[PDB]
Amino acid sequence: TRPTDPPVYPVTVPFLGHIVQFGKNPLEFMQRCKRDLKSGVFTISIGGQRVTIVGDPHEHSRFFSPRNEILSPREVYTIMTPVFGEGVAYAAPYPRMREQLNFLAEELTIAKFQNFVPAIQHEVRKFMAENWKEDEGVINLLEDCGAMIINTACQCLFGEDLRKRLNARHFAQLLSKMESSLIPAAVFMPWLLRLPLPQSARCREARAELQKILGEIIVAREKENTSDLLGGLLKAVYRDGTRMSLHEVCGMIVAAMFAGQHTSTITTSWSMLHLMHPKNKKWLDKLHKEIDEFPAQLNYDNVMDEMPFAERCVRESIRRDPPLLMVMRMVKAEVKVGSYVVPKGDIIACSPLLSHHDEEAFPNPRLWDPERDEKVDGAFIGFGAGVHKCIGQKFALLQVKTILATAFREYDFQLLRDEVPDPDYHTMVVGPTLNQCLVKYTRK
Amino acid sequence: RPTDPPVYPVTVPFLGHIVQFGKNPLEFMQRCKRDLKSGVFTISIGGQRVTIVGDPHEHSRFFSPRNEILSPREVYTIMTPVFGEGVAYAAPYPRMREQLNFLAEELTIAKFQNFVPAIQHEVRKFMAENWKEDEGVINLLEDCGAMIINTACQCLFGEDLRKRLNARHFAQLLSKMESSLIPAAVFMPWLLRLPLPQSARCREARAELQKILGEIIVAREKEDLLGGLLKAVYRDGTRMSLHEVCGMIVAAMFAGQHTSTITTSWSMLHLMHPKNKKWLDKLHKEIDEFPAQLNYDNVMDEMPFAERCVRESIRRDPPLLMVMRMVKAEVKVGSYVVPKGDIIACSPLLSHHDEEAFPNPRLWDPERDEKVDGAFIGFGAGVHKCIGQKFALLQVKTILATAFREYDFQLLRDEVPDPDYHTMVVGPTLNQCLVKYTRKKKLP
Ligand code: HEM
Ligand code: HEM
Ligand SMILES: OC(Cn1cncn1)(Cn1cncn1)c1ccc(F)cc1F
Ligand SMILES: OC(Cn1cncn1)(Cn1cncn1)c1ccc(F)cc1F
Secondary structure, eight states: OOSSSOOBOOOSSGGGBTHHHHHHOHHHHHHHHHHHTTOSEEEEEETTEEEEEEOOGGGTHHHHSSOTTTEESTTTSGGGHHHHOTTSGGGSOHHHHHHHHHHHHTTSSSSGGGGHHHHHHHHHHHHHHHHSOSSEEEEEHHHHHHHHHHHHHHHHHOOHHHHHHSOHHHHHHHHHHHHHTOOTHHHHOGGGGGSOOHHHHHHHHHHHHHHHHHHHHHHHHTOOOOSSHHHHHHHOBOSSSOBOOHHHHHHHHHHHHHHHHHHHHHHHHHHHHHHHSGGGHHHHHHHHHHHTTSOSSOOHHHHHHSOHHHHHHHHHHHHHSOSSOOEEEEESSOEEOSSSEEOTTOEEEEOHHHHTTOTTTSSSTTSOOTTOOOSSTTOOOTTOOGGGOOSSHHHHHHHHHHHHHHHHHHEEEEESSSSOOOEETTSSSOEEOGGGOEEEEEEO | OOSSOOBOOOSSGGGBTHHHHHHOHHHHHHHHHHHTTOSEEEEEETTEEEEEEOOGGGTHHHHSSOTTTEEOTTTSGGGHHHHOTTSGGGSOHHHHHHHHHHHHTTSSSSGGGGHHHHHHHHHHHHHHHHSOSSEEEEEHHHHHHHHHHHHHHHHHOOHHHHHHSOHHHHHHHHHHHHTTOOGGGGTOGGGGGSOOHHHHHHHHHHHHHHHHHHHHHHHHTOOOHHHHHHTOBOSSSOBOOHHHHHHHHHHHHHHHHHHHHHHHHHHHHHHHSGGGHHHHHHHHHHHTTSOSSOOHHHHHHSOHHHHHHHHHHHHHSOSSOOEEEEESSOEEOSSSEEOTTOEEEEOHHHHTTOTTTSSSTTSOOTTOOOSSTTOOOTTOOGGGOOSSHHHHHHHHHHHHHHHHHHEEEEESSSSOOOEETTSSSOEEOGGGOEEEEEEOOOOO
């Protein structure tokens, strides 16, 4: 304790200290901390590592503004090394990391988008046509949104040859094996990673199978690409004279697909679940009124400039239940957050989960109300902000919006459950409880 | 202190020797046996003393003592989310025994009568559907996996359970439970008090199975393994709960799935390697005696050579590396006494490589025999000896008889695969298992 420290939540069980409670309900646990300590800015213990939460939305900037030398991502992203590739992205020196991210940025922006809406529509219609064939049936909506999200992304981002060698299902399995390997505990207790774990070898094996497949597509392709993701990075030349290695190319592909697969899936699922719930009739009607204006074949302009209501729907689903609960950095140099200074060596967090539930910024936050707006500027941080803000944001909104436009024009849905699913907090990227996602479709 | 196995010296207290042991348990335990000039020694895994009874003349003093002296419960804690909380090792010891015995009395032995032809059918159906070409490239470890689930399901389940729970779906649930486990935790039990998404994947998989099994039982109550345990009445008046029935089904299939798969794969890999021509000929000479339809007697009393082949595969590379107990009361092992609170281990991997018991142990030689009585402990011994042993050998022998009568195989690699030690249950490195099949016959 220095006298310029956020209040600390009292710890019992030193070795843990709060990992079980936080682990069990992050929302409920961080709101008890904010309330009992009368402070938005506080410090918990996770396995003995101090974690300072910047849970006051008026203070959001002081987390998202500072450069890499003050608030550092590398150390928190160490867990992802076996996914992105060993010296890749956050694990490269910071200027090279930025080029790598920017090369990905410039493949989702924005002459590239031109063929995206119709490629998303085609995959959605093919999926509904093959899986929702009956007049009426029961589906698990989280599993099917998953299938659609991989199918649509693949079709937007890959040539037919890569898709003929790596089908969407096969891809989802590889991505899924990588994700289910990770142990979020270790972000806070990095010694856990010096332990032999079969999980990390499952995750390297998965990554290595992808690079192998990708390498075969590249040799094949170099015997007589244009718009597609792979062919872009193939042609990326760094500041210096040099080109990307296979390992890095695989890196940025993994990173883009890994990023969007679970988060957009969850978001599409949440959005539909709200929309189909009886109380939410008012909003389902508003959506049909936006979307029934449009033709069978949609375009860039339809989805982008002319669906502000669908967007509000997607944006509020992520507001109520952000899939990424916590944004984190390692405090390399002490920092003023409000009053208080966060000491060197702390993990500093800014939590979309917690900030999207501040009663000042989001009055009555458990209410899903798509016509609402943040009452504190910057409060919404679902896709981050500052130097690390999400670069799939635009792709993600357009994909989810396009699916909603296509699914609801064609089907009605009934939630088979009285209430909207609980969020299930046992997993790294957080979604609605899988158990509770049975829905009944009626073909219109 | 004076009556303690020599301790391998520890640097890095926190880990002990988890990394070395983690990376190559054979080489690491043989360096310990050689430099300390003692079969019986004590290593450190994350700070827990582990005493290895690595002298085969001393095997009995590990396997003989009853549950009050050498206790399994504490080492089986990791499997709680698989078998079911409170189930098997987690029940009091007498009830544990009834539960195991009920499982035992479902693989012994009027039950076996229909097993050989059900294994053959599934094997021929699999080859017919997957090895259809004149010749092709398969991954042998994956396909032995598919055969092992298909054959066991067809031996153990009624049509109705197989209709509702297909073999592939079963394999996924099993595989999801198994890839959750963190063997480190057997030695550092505090790791389990950590919220991990791994355990929740494992519980969810378990709970999907019970739910399906519960639907089969209600369906079935409106006029094989499942129906046995349904019929089981304990010593007292009472019957098994759904939770325990699920437990014993999960335990028997979890048990056989990865170990038999690994054994079938090893067996074939050796037999197909050019240097093992001598043995591949002997096998053909045993099996070419028999008709197209085999029976119990064919596989059981009349294939001593195939068995030697299976047994030597497990001898060179046992899938379960370490048999373990918690020392509740101090025990004499050779000279030395193993203190209360030590984990006492007996390692098939290490004892199957003692020069005395198994001269030149990295040689696969199916005609060899242990030169130290009891040395082979691939299926354990004493009160906890494997109860799928008989079923395992019959399954593998029946597959080998069926595969090799119909196909030849070429290892696509100069040498037999390395064992891959990154995984809980150990097999041949998946990478190195590409094999080329040549079909010897036609129809379908
Ligand atoms: C609703 C879906 C998504 C959500 C909620 C989301 C959320 C976020 C958040 C909160 C961050 C900040 C990470 C940090 O500050 O450490 C982020 C970063 C990132 N996202 Fe997403 N994201 C989504 C979709 C996508 C998609 C589809 C892509 C595919 C390109 C993507 C690629 C990335 C990348 C590369 C970063 C790091 C970029 C950088 O470090 O500058 N995301 N995302
Ligand atoms: C090649 C295949 C197999 C190998 C190498 C193997 C190995 C072993 C070993 C070493 C043990 C000793 C456990 C201990 O002392 O902790 C064991 C126990 C056991 N096995 Fe297997 N096993 C195999 C196949 C199977 C199969 C197919 C089943 C299916 C029912 C099965 C069911 C069991 C059960 C229930 C136990 C515990 C019984 C008790 O504690 O009394 N095993 N096995
Ligand atoms: O944030 C992730 C990594 N992550 C955090 N929790 C679990 N995985 C996911 N993500 C970000 N946007 C969408 N998904 C990510 C994946 C890729 C990446 F380049 C950065 C990055 F933070
Ligand atoms: O030993 C297993 C479970 N296990 C041990 N290490 C990793 N998983 C495997 N096993 C035993 N025979 C075949 N496989 C087991 C599974 C079921 C069981 F009842 C006991 C038991 F030890």
